[PDB]
Amino acid sequence: MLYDLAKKRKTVRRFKKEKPPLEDLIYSLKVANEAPSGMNAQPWRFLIVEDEKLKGQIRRVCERSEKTFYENVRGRLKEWLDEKRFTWRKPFLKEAPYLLLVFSEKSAPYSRESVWLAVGYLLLALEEKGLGSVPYTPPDFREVEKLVNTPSELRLEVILPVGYPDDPKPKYPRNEVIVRYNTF
Amino acid sequence: KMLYDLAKKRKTVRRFKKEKPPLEDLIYSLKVANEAPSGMNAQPWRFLIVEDEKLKGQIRRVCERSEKTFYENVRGRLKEWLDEKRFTWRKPFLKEAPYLLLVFSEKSAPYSRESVWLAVGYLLLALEEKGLGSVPYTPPDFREVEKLVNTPSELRLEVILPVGYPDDPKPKYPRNEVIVRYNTF
Ligand SMILES: Cc1cc2nc3c(=O)[nH]c(=O)nc-3n(C[C@H](O)[C@H](O)[C@H](O)COP(=O)(O)O)c2cc1C
Ligand SMILES: Cc1cc2nc3c(=O)[nH]c(=O)nc-3n(C[C@H](O)[C@H](O)[C@H](O)COP(=O)(O)O)c2cc1C
Ligand SMILES: N[C@@H](Cc1ccc(O)c(F)c1)C(=O)O
Numbered sequence: 141m142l143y144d145l146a147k148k149r150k151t152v153r154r155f156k157k158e159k160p161p162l163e164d165l166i167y168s169l170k171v172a173n174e175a176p177s178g179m180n181a182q183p184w185r186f187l188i189v190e191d192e193k194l195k196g197q198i199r200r201v202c203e204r205s206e207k208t209f210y211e212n213v214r215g216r217l218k219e220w221l222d223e224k225r226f227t228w229r230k231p232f233l234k235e236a237p238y239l240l241l242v243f244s245e246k247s248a249p250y251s252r253e254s255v256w257l258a259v260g261y262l263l264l265a266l267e268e269k270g271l272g273s274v275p276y277t278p279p280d281f282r283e284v285e286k287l288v289n290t291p292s293e294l295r296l297e298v299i300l301p302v303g304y305p306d307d308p309k310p311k312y313p314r315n316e317v318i319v320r321y322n323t324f
Numbered sequence: 325k326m327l328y329d330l331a332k333k334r335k336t337v338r339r340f341k342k343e344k345p346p347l348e349d350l351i352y353s354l355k356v357a358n359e360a361p362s363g364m365n366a367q368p369w370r371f372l373i374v375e376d377e378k379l380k381g382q383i384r385r386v387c388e389r390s391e392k393t394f395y396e397n398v399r400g401r402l403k404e405w406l407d408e409k410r411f412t413w414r415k416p417f418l419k420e421a422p423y424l425l426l427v428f429s430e431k432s433a434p435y436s437r438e439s440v441w442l443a444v445g446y447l448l449l450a451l452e453e454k455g456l457g458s459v460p461y462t463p464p465d466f467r468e469v470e471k472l473v474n475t476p477s478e479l480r481l482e483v484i485l486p487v488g489y490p491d492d493p494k495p496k497y498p499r500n501e502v503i504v505r506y507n508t509f
C-alpha cells in the first residue's frame with residue numbers, strides 16, 4: 141500500500157558501503173519523471189554523482205557552509221537541530237554511494253513546485269526500491285552547483301544521497317492531519 | 325504492481341463527476357501526504373477542504389478572472405503550450421469537483437514550499453490509489469483565493485487541488501525520457 145510506503149519511508153543519513161545498482165536509482169527517476177509538472181515541462185534534471193573526489197568536494201563545501209550555519213543558528217531552528225543531534229557534519233555526502241542532485245529548469249513554469257512534487261515521487265520510489273535518502277539542502281547551493289558545472293538554466297534543488305540504508309535512526313513523529321473545511 | 329505503474333497511470337483530471345467521494349478517500353491522501361518528509365519535520369502543509377458550492381463558485385470566479393487576465397498577457401512557451409492544448413481561462417472544474425483541496429504551506433517553516441510540494445507528490449499518488457483525480461491548479465494570483473477562505477497570514481496557499489472522481493479525463497501527456505547526467509555537466 142502507498143500509505144505503508146510513505147509511512148515507512150524515513151530519512152536515511154547513513155548508508156551501507158555497498159553501492160546499489162544504478163537501475164534502482166534510474167527506476168526512481170523514471171517514476172519521478174511521470175509526475176505532473178507545470179505545462180508538462182518536466183523541469184527536473186538529475187545528476188548522479190558517484191565520483192568519490194567530487195562527493196568529497198561536495199561534502200567539504202557543504203560542511204564548510206554548514207559550519208557557519210551551525211555557528212550562528214539560533215532559536216527554534218537551533219533547538220530542533222540540537223534535539224535531533226544534527227551538526228555541520230554531513231559525512232553522508234561523501235559516504236553515500238550516490239549523490240543524486242536534483243535540478244529544476246529555471247525557466248519552466250512552476251519549475252520548483254514541479255520538481256519538488258516529483259521529488260515526492262522519487263523518494264517513494266527510492267523507498268520502494270529499498271534505498272534510503274535524505275533531501276539534503278546545502279546552505280550555499282551555488283558552490284555545489286559550480287562543482288558540477290551546473291548550467292545557468294538549471295537550479296540545484298536538493299542533494300539526495302542515495303544508498304542502502306544503514307541502521308537509520310527512527311522516523312520522526314507525524315502529527316495527525318487536522319483538516320479544515322471551507323474556510324479558516 | 326509497482327509505484328511506477330501508479331505514477332505512470334496518474335494523470336491530470338480536469339473533468340470530474342459530481343458524485344462526492346467519501347471524505348475518507350481524500351483524508352487518506354492527506355494521511356499519506358502527511359507521512360512525507362519536510363524541513364525540520366515541520367510538516368508545513370495545511371489542508372483546507374472546500375466543498376461549499378457558493379465558496380467553490382467564488383473561488384472559481386476569482387481564479388477565472390485572474391486566469392482571464394493572464395491569458396490576455398501570457399507569452400512565450402507557456403502561451404504556446406496553453407494555446408496548442410486549447411486551454412482557456414475558464415475553470416469549470418473548480419465548481420464541478422466535489423472537493424477543492426486547498427493546500428497551504430506554513431511560511432515560517434524551513435523549506436516549507438519545497439516540503440509541501442513534495443507532500444503534494446505523495447498526495448497525488450494517494451489520490452490515484454483511491455481512484456480520485458486531481459489537478460494542481462495554480463491560478464496566477466492566490467491572494468484573492470486566500471482571502472476568500474480567510475487564510476491566516478502564516479500560511480501560503482500553494483495549490484488548489486480539485487478532487488473528485490474522474491469523468492473520462494483526457495489522456496496523459498507524453499513524458500520525455502528522464503534526463504540523467506553523471507558526476508558533472
Ligand atoms: C506545479 C504545477 C502547477 C500546475 N498548474 C496547473 C494549472 O494552473 N492549470 C492546469 O490546468 N494544470 C496545471 N497543472 C497540471 C499540468 O498541466 C500537468 O501536470 C501536465 O500537463 C502533465 O499532465 P499529465 O500528467 O496528465 O501528462 C499543474 C501541474 C503542476 C505540477
Ligand atoms: C525540503 C527538505 C529539506 C531538507 N533538508 C535537510 C537538510 O538540509 N539536512 C538534513 O539532514 N535533512 C534535511 N531534510 C530531511 C528532514 O530533516 C526530514 O525530512 C524530517 O526530519 C523528517 O524525517 P522523517 O521522515 O525521518 O521523520 C530535508 C527535508 C526536506 C523535505
Ligand atoms: N493556470 C493557468 C495556466 C496553466 C495551465 C496548465 C499548467 O500546467 C500551467 F502550469 C499553467 C490555467 O489553468 O489555464
Ligand SMILES: N[C@@H](Cc1ccc(O)c(F)c1)C(=O)O
Binds near residue numbers: 221277363434
Ligand atoms: N541543512 C542543515 C540544517 C537542516 C537539517 C535538517 C532539516 O530538515 C533542515 F530543514 C535543515 C543540516 O543538514 O544540518
Ligand SMILES: [Cl-]
Binds near residue numbers: 150151152274275362
Ligand atoms: Cl527525509
Ligand SMILES: [Cl-]
Binds near residue numbers: 459
Ligand atoms: Cl496534473
Ligand SMILES: [Cl-]
Binds near residue numbers: 312364365
Ligand atoms: Cl520532530
Ligand SMILES: [Cl-]
Binds near residue numbers: 431437480
Ligand atoms: Cl512562503
Ligand SMILES: [Cl-]
Binds near residue numbers: 336337338339
Ligand atoms: Cl480531463
